Design a protein around this ligand. Sequence first.
Ligand SMILES: [Co+2]
Ligand SMILES: [Co+2]
Length: 294
Amino acid sequence: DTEKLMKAGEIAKKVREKAIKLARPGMLLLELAESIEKMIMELGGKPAFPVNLSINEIAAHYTPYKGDTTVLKEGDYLKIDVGVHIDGFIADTAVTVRVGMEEDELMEAAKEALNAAISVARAGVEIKELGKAIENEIRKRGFKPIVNLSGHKIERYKLHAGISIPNIYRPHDNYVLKEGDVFAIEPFATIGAGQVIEVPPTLIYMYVRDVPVRVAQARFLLAKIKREYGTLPFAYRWLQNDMPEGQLKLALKTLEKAGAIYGYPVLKEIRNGIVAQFEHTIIVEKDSVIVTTE
Ligand SMILES: [Co+2]
Ligand SMILES: [Co+2]
């Protein structure tokens, strides 16, 4: 279904743009996310996942927690990733911002990557064409694409769904773009290496599997998890009050170990090189594409 998808787009769109506006030095991340997640629900959206406010060397998979006194300092490169869905049709967008400052050529690189990528996409294109297009844009400005962190196919209630949209030309990325395919195209660019690493904390999670749990407490959480969130990612923070202190963190850890949920840790540039990201969701047509998030 297109329109549902398109609506998701429209909202992701505005919500993003508003997030840009709020993003000044001193602004509390926690607050920001909360504003952003609200404005979604306001417009008749629900999140596809918590807003990912990632700063600098941090590349993805940061979304704050209650007591997260992270505030933006001027000159910080802020990645904003915003998820919205409408009966499970997803729009997924992301923009880098350098706080209280103008567009940097790091930012330019990622941005033009996306555009270039959109440009060459049509039904019947081989994925690598978009790879090359992005590789090209970033290297050519003296910069390094992040190679293990890219776009991805999208489906109904499926944020990542088979096929990645790489930021490098590789010769056996041959998936031929079907007409109707939905896809996030995220280029990341960097001054460091082009390679990211898992580091704690682990702040986003996902229901993966109905498995049985020994401990009463965790089992009831898994119910509230499936109920309020299903197959979509959800922040730590959305669950916070419901329990005592580290009683939640633990309960979450018990569930990981059991195989019921997965924990998305925080991705950081291998060499703390600063990182840029722009993503649009798109949909394929014979001879062009719909850009759900402009
Ligand atoms: Co995303
Ligand atoms: Co994404």
